[PDB]
């Protein structure tokens, strides 16, 4: 019941939009070492996504301001921009390493079901990609290596265990395609994997469950929308 | 260039 | 430069949407005796509005979840919700008592221009009104009286100093009307006031400047949207 | 019931 109490506190935190309290309540549930239910897996992800998201949204904004004041030549200000970015960067490093560790320690070893195994190996890839975004050089290269072997491990399981209509598999494809395009700067690969996951889905769209319908269609929409932008630039 | 990634799954 | 360096850190924090860091940066500039410029005044308001705004949204949502779980009769949950609500109420108290303190101690005295005086007295009413929202019994009535004398003081100054078209005066009239409606349960006054402040603006629409045009017309449109909503089911 | 109030200047 102490576990159910924590899940409830996370839900109150979600609707209250206090996502710091959400990760904490859901962190204690991960450490419980029991395999998370589909509701708990979602809550944990929604929590750590919003908290890491907020910091990134800031990083990109101040990053653009750094490029603006780079041309202006206001050296006095450029120092403050960098100090503010390095402050936000350390936070991105902490939150990413927080969830990467509890994945490696509690969740990934515990997860036995094909669906759960994929969901986490994907999650690992995402937070290694988020480290790669701001990372510089041999720091970035290590984060990219980690990211790929995670997505690859997720993909190798997803191929046999999950069908192509499954939200988790499509979501993985999208993030792994976004990974290829942004991190590895290989658009030809990003477009293949995206077009592959998409065409595999529409082939068997008649099998898609009403439960998973809204989740997967949105993900498919976000695939074909990214495919349009990537192909029009080529 | 920022490109949309996997969103937050709907409740149930 | 110490103050100019802080204003910039606040501006970076504004765009980054890190409003916790924005209040701090602009809190130090306010602590300095020197009166805040219109830009600095705005950056402070923006910073402290967003930090409280977030909690106020949280308070209203959990307060409505409580209301729902009252009918369900989940006593185990109601204790968890009440405790979470209280945690937020204490936060709203601390952040309110911050801005009110730095208003009374530093800004209100320092404020010498007519425009500044109204804005800081308006600001005081706003943050005694936000106290009065989640406040109960004697505490609420005391927060209301504190808000009224603040709004009344601001209004007495705004009538003579500023013109009716000015965004600061229209903003006061709008916040004072919301006060009479939500806090004092005096809706017939709320509407009477909101309309009065509207009529006085449109009468002198020629006087309005192209600079302060957008700021005023937006607040004028809100006053009307409220007036419509309060006078139709 | 919550109603629009004076927003922070642009
Ligand atoms: Br009322
Ligand atoms: Na409304």
Residue numbers in the entry:
A (entry chain B): 2 to 235
B (entry chain C): 95 to 106
C (entry chain A): 2 to 234
D (entry chain P): 95 to 104
Text taken from the publication that reported this structure:
14-3-3 family proteins are important regulatory molecules involved in a staggering number of cellular processes that interact with target proteins in a phosphorylation-dependent manner. GATAD1 is a transcription factor affecting proliferation and cell cycle via controlling AKT signaling. The GATAD1 S102P mutation we investigated in the screen was described to cause dilated cardiomyopathy (DCM) in an autosomal recessive manner in a consanguineous family. Building upon existing data for the role of 14-3-3 proteins in nucleocytoplasmic transport, we propose that the binding of 14-3-3 to GATAD1 masks the NLS and impairs the protein’s nuclear localization.
We found that GATAD1 pS102 interacted with 14-3-3ε with a binding constant of about 3 µM. The two 14-3-3ε proteins in the asymmetric unit (ASU) of the crystals formed a two-fold symmetric homodimer, which is typical for the 14-3-3 protein family. Each monomer consists of nine α-helices and harbors one phosphorylated GATAD1 peptide in a binding groove formed by helices α3, α5, α7, and α9. 14-3-3ε binds the central phospho-serine 102 of the GATAD1 peptide via the triad Arg57, Arg130, and Tyr131, which is highly conserved in the 14-3-3 family. In addition, Lys50 of 14-3-3ε directly interacts with the phosphate group of the peptide. GATAD1 Pro104 packs into a hydrophobic cage formed by 14-3-3ε Leu219, Ile220, and Leu223, whereas Tyr100 of the peptide shows a T-shaped π stacking against Tyr182 and Trp231 of 14-3-3ε. Our structure explains the deficits of the non-phosphorylated GATAD1 peptide and the pathogenic S102P and the phosphomimetic S102D peptide variants to interact with 14-3-3ε. The non-phosphorylated serine, as well as the proline chain (in the S102P variant) and the aspartic acid side chains (in the S102D peptide variant), are too short to reach into the positively charged triad patch in 14-3-3ε for proper binding (bottom). A glutamic acid side chain in the S102E mutant, on the other hand, appears to be able to reach into the binding triad; however, it is not able to form a hydrogen bond with Tyr131 nor Lys50 of 14-3-3ε (bottom right).
